[PDB]
Amino acid sequence: SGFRKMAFPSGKVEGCMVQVTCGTTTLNGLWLDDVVYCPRHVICTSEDMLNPNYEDLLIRKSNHNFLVQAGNVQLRVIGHSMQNCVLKLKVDTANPKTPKYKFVRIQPGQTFSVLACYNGSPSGVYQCAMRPNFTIKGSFLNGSCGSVGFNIDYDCVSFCYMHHMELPTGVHAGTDLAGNFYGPFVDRQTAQAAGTDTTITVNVLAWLYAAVINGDRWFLNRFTTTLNDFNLVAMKYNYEPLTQDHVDILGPLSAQTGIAVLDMCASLKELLQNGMNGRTILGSALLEDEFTPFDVVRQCSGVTFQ
Amino acid sequence: SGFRKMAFPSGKVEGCMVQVTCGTTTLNGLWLDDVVYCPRHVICTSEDMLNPNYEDLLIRKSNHNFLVQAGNVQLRVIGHSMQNCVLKLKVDTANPKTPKYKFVRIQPGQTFSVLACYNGSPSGVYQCAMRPNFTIKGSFLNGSCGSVGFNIDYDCVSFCYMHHMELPTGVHAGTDLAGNFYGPFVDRQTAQAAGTDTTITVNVLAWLYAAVINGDRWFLNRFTTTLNDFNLVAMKYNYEPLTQDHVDILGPLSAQTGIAVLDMCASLKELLQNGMNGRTILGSALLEDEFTPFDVVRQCSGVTFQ
Ligand SMILES: *[C@H](O)[C@H](C[C@@H]1CCNC1=O)NC(=O)[C@H](CC(C)(C)C)NC(=O)c1cc2ccccc2[nH]1
Ligand SMILES: *[C@H](O)[C@H](C[C@@H]1CCNC1=O)NC(=O)[C@H](CC(C)(C)C)NC(=O)c1cc2ccccc2[nH]1
C-alpha cells in the first residue's frame, strides 16, 4: 500500500541526453540513432529572441556551428534541418544506448515523467500532467530546454514532450517531439498567457479510488447522482465535464472497490460543496487531479518495465 | 521556476537491480561488484515468518538454493552470508554497471529517492523522507522488498535504504545497506506499530523559502519571534524543536530571500494558529515537510549529476 506521485525509471532516457551549444546558447538535446533533437531556439541570441525568423537564421548556420557533447565525447554534426519548432542535427554516430522508442503526442489530462536536465546532464525526474490549457506545472530553470517528457510501455519509451519555455505565471510550455507546440504558444518572447485552466474530473475520481484502495474511506456516502446532475456541479467548480467514456475507463477501479462510478461522483459532489473539513485524502488537503486511471491501476497493482 | 517533489535520475541504480528467488519467495537484490544484497527474509516460507530463527534457517541453505536473475542472465551464487538483516550473496560475476557508491545511514528528516522494483525490474521512482519515527511513507506492494533508497552526489550513489516491510498503518520500514533497521522494528510478523510521528520543522521552513523563491508570498508578515517563543508554538502543534543548527542550515535560503529565519518562523507560527484560510502554498493546502534545505537549494538552483 501507499500512493506516491511516481515517475518512470529514467535510465533509458538518461542515456539519450546530450548537450547542444550554438554560439552563446547551451541547452539539451535528445540523441536517438544518428539524430540529436533539440529546441530550434538554440540558434538564437538574446536580441534574436524578440521576434526571430528561424528559417532565415538557420540557412546562416554551418554544421560546425553546432557543438554536440555526449558526456565527454564530442559528436560531429554532419547535417541539420528544422522540423517545426525542433532542430534535427544529424551526427556521425548512432547512439548505442538508443532504446526502442516512439514519438507520441499526448492529450490534456494525461501524465508523463520529466527528466530535468542541464548541460546534457540529468538533474531529477518527476511526474507531470498535461493541463487542459496545454501547459504543464513543471520545475524548470534556465538551461533546461530540451529536457523531455516520456512514458514507458514495457521496454519502449514514448517521448511526448520537449521543454521550451516558461510562461509568466510560472507554468511551462513545449512541443511534442515533432516540434509542434502543445497549445497556442510560440517560441518567441512575446506577451503569452496560459489561459484559463480546469480541474481534470476523471483523474480526481481515479485518485478517490486510489484512496479507497489504500484505506481512506471517510469521504464515501450512500447517496448517488445522475451523470447529468454531477456535470451541473462540475461546471460550477471549474471541473471538466464527465463523459460516459470516462465512466467506462473508471470501470476497473469501480469493479475492484465495489463503488459505482456515479456513487464516487456523489462523493466528489459533497467534497466540492463542503470541502474536506480539516481532513486529508492520501496525505493531501486538496483534490488531486494529476493521476490518471492508468496511473492508479499501475501503482496499486505493481506493473514494471523491461 | 516551479517546485516539484523530484527524485534523482534512477539509471545508475536500475543497472544494479536483480531478482532473487529462494524457494517460494521472490524479491529484489542489489548487485554491486560480485555481491548481491537482499533482505534476509527471502530464506523464509510463510510459516517461517511468524517467529523465525534466521541463523538456523541459513545454515540449512545451499548456494544453489538462491536463484539470482540479472535480466535474462542467471547469476551463479558461490557464497552466502548474513549481515544483520541483509543477505550478502557472492556471485561469480562482477556487475559491469556498478556505479561508484557508498553505504550511508541517513537521519530522520533527510530525504532520498526510492526505485520501486518487482521481480528485479524497476517500476517507478519517487522521493521519500525518513520520518522522525523512522518509518517512510512509501508506495510498496508484495514483491517490492529489496528495492533501495538512495541519493546521488555528483557521480556517486549513496545507498541509504532497503525495503523490508509494511506496518499496519500503511507506512514502511527497512534497513540501511548494512542490514540495520531504521527504528525499533524487526523482520518478523509480530505486532509492530510505527510510533507517534512529528512534523519536521526545518523542512517546513525550507519549503516556505522555496515558495517565496517561486512567487508565493501571501503568508509573510512583519512580525518576528524568538527561537524560544517559536519552539513553544512547535510543541503545541507536534512540530519538532528548532535548533540553532537548523537556523544555520537555513542561512543560505535566508540570505537569498532576505527573510530572516526567525521571521519565517513567525510566519509558520501564524500558519499553524490560523491555518491557510483556503489558500495554497506551492500548490499544497498543507504545510509540507519532506523537502530538506538541500533539496530546495538543489532544485531552485539547478544542480545536476554525472
Ligand atoms: C530554455 O532553457 C528556457 C527555459 C525557461 C527558462 C526559465 N524557465 C524555463 O523553463 N526557455 C527560455 O528561456 C525561453 C526562450 C524562448 C522564448 C526563445 C523559447 N524563454 C522563456 O521561457 C521566457 C522568457 C520570458 C520573458 C518574460 C517572462 C517570461 C518568460 N519566459
Ligand atoms: C516484501 O516484498 C514485503 C513488502 C511488503 C508487502 C506489502 N507491502 C510491503 O511493503 N515484506 C513483507 O511481506 C513482510 C515480510 C516480513 C515480515 C518477513 C519482513 N511482511 C509485511 O510487510 C507485513 C506482514 C503483515 C501482516 C499484518 C499486518 C501488516 C503486515 N506487514
Task: Judge whether A205 and A252 are in contact, CB under 8 Å.
Answer: no
Evaluate: CB of A48 within 6 angstroms of ligand 1.
Answer: no
B69 close to A (CB below 8 A): no
B139 close to A (CB below 8 A): yes
Q: Do B303 and A137 touch (CB under 8 A)?
A: no
What's the sign of the alpha-carbon dihedral B238, B244, B245, B251? positive
Q: Do B124 and A9 touch (CB under 8 A)?
A: yes
The b/e string for A37-49 (b: 16+ C-beta within 10 A; e otherwise) is bbbbbbbbeeebe
Q: What SS3 state is found at A82?
A: strand
Q: After which residues is chain A broken (C to N over 2.5 A)?
A: none
Mutate: best of A126, A135, A297, partner B, most B CBs <10 A: A126
* Distance of CA B168 from the midpoint of ligand 2 (Å): 9
d(CA B83, CA A73): 41
**At A180, phi and psi to the nearest 5?**
-95, 115
User: Any idea which residues of B carry the catalytic annotation?
Assistant: 41, 145
User: DSSP states of B93-148 as a string?
Assistant: S--TT--EEEE-PPPTT-EEEEEEEETTEEEEEEEEEB-TTS-B-----TT-TT-E
- Cα of first residue to Cα of last residue in chain B, in angstroms, is 23
In this structure, the number of other CB atoms found within 10 A of the CB of residue B107 comes to: 8
B283 close to A (CB below 8 A): yes
Our CA dihedral for B226, B229, B233, B236, rounded to 10 degrees, sits at 150
Task: State the smallest CA–CA distance between residue A215 and chain B in angstroms.
Answer: 9
B125 close to A (CB below 8 A): yes
Q: What SS3 state is found at A256?
A: helix
Cell readout for A290 is 494529476
Evaluate: CB of A187 within 6 angstroms of ligand 1.
Answer: yes
| CA-closest residue to ligand 2 atom 28 | B168
Q: What SS3 state is found at B251?
A: helix
What's the sign of the alpha-carbon dihedral B42, B48, B53, B58? negative
Q: In what order do the strands lie in the sheet with B66-70?
A: B73-75, B66-70, B17-22, B25-32, B35-39, B86-91, B77-83
Q: How far is CA A113 from the centre of its chain?
A: 6
* Distance of CA B187 from the midpoint of ligand 2 (Å): 9
Q: Do B6 and A303 touch (CB under 8 A)?
A: no
Task: Judge whether B157 and B39 are in contact, CB under 8 Å.
Answer: no
Helix axes A261-274, A227-236, angle to 10 degrees: 30
Q: Do B118 and A304 touch (CB under 8 A)?
A: yes
Resolution in A: 1.9
Q: How far is CA A109 from the centre of its chain?
A: 9
B216 close to A (CB below 8 A): no
The residue whose CB lies within 8 Å of the most ligand 1 atoms, and thus the one to mutate among A166, A167, A186, A192, is A166
